[PDB]
Paper text:
A multiple amino acid sequence alignment of HaNLP3 protein with several toxic NLP representatives in the region between these two cysteines pinpointed a few possible amino acid residues that could affect NLP toxicity: Ala64, Asn67 and Glu71 in non-toxic HaNLP3 and corresponding Pro41, Asp44 and Asn48 in toxic NLPPya. To determine whether slightly less toxic NLPPyaP41A, D44N, N48E displays any structural divergence from the wild-type protein, we determined its crystal structure. Except from the triple mutation, the overall structure strongly resembles the wild-type NLPPya structure with Cα RMSD value of 0.3 Å and 0.5 Å for chain A and chain B, respectively (calculated by DALI). Interestingly, in the NLPPyaP41A, D44N, N48E we observed another variation of the Mg2+ ion octahedral coordination. Here, the Mg2+ ion is directly coordinated by Asp104 and Glu106 and indirectly by Asp93 and His159 via four water molecules. This further highlights that Mg2+ coordination can adjust to the spatial arrangement of different NLPPya scaffolds. Notably, the NLPPyaP41A, D44N, N48E mutant exhibits a limited flexibility of L1, L2, and Lc3 as compared to the wild-type protein, in line with its reduced necrotic activity. The mutations induce the loss of a persistent H-bond (between side chains of Asp44-Asn48), which in NLPPya firmly links Lc3 to L1, affecting their flexibility. The loss of H-bonds linking Lc3 with L1 induced by these mutations not only reduces the thermal stability of NLPPyaP41A, D44N, N48E, but also affects the protein internal movements. Furthermore, the NLPPyaP41A, D44N, N48E mutant, functionally and structurally characterized in this work, pinpoints another important structural element to regulate stability and functional dynamics of the protein.
Necrosis and ethylene inducing peptide 1 (Nep1)-like proteins (NLPs) are widely distributed among prokaryotic and eukaryotic organisms, like fungi, bacteria and oomycetes, and may infect a range of different crops, such as potato, tomato, soybean and tobacco, thus posing major threat to agriculture worldwide. It was shown that NLPs function as cytolytic toxins that induce plasma membrane leakage by binding to plant membrane sphingolipid receptor. NLPs share a conserved necrosis inducing protein (NPP1) domain, typically containing the heptapeptide motif, GHRHDWE, which is crucial for toxicity. The aim of the current study was to provide structural and functional information on similarities and differences between non-toxic HaNLP3 and toxic NLPPya, both members of the oomycete type 1 NLP group.
Numbering used by the authors: 1 to 55, 59 to 93, 99 to 154, 157 to 213
Write the structure that this text describes.
């Protein structure tokens, strides 16, 4: 069930308890919000979710509300870390969920081989990962509408948010993200995770 969009507390980034969670902290991207909403927390540990906003950005520009999400897995032999942002709205529509995937050759050597970024029903792909889109090993992502909002790769510097990973959530939060109706938007790291990795795959 919903609570006010500006009353979802920021889930504090915990210490990484295993190599999966440490990898997701290591590869946390930067985001450059060119226009529209800042990223907000979408869920709290009790499983309450953001009510979002009716469809400028004055109700969704508070930098203190920032949150980023991730979930990790494998596909076709590669290691994928999906990072995902929720915005209270994208005339547009209530709610917005977008994601990028950082592809590693495997979790041991952990070389970035490709990046994917959600745009409408598909993904932009950078294969091999263009070094102008990387600040070290930190991917530089843009959030912008020219058409509703889409992610992209950018040379511009961006901002980072406290990260709470799927693997670190309470069961009540994972349950809420699986079952909640986000309307025109869809959580991309729930039970559709592997299906999304297929769509994001770079070959
Ligand atoms: Mg969207
Ligand atoms: Mg591996």
């Amino acid at each position: 069930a919903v609570i006010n969009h500006d009353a979802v507390p920021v889930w504090p980034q915990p210490e990484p308890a295993d190599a999966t969670q440490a990898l997701a902290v290591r590869f946390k991207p930067q985001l450059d919000v060119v226009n529209g909403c800042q990223p907000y927390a979408a869920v709290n540990p009790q499983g309450e979710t953001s009510g979002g906003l009716k469809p400028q950005a004055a109700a969704c520009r508070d930098m203190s509300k920032a949150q980023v999400y991730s979930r990790s897995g494998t596909y076709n032999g590669y290691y994928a870390i999906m990072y995902s942002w929720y915005m209270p709205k994208d005339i547009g529509h209530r709610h917005d969920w977008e994601n990028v995937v950082v592809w590693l050759d495997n979790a041991a050597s952990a070389n970035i081989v490709a990046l994917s970024a959600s745009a409408h029903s598909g993904y932009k792909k950078s294969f091999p990962a263009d070094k102008s889109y990387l600040d070290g090993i930190t991917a530089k992502i843009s959030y912008k509408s020219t058409l509703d909002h889409e992610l992209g790769f950018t040379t511009s510097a961006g901002k980072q948010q406290p990260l709470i990973q799927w693997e670190q959530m309470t069961q009540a939060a994972r349950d809420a993200l699986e079952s909640t109706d986000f309307g025109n938007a869809n959580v991309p790291f729930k039970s559709n995770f592997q299906d999304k990795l297929v769509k994001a795959f770079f070959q």
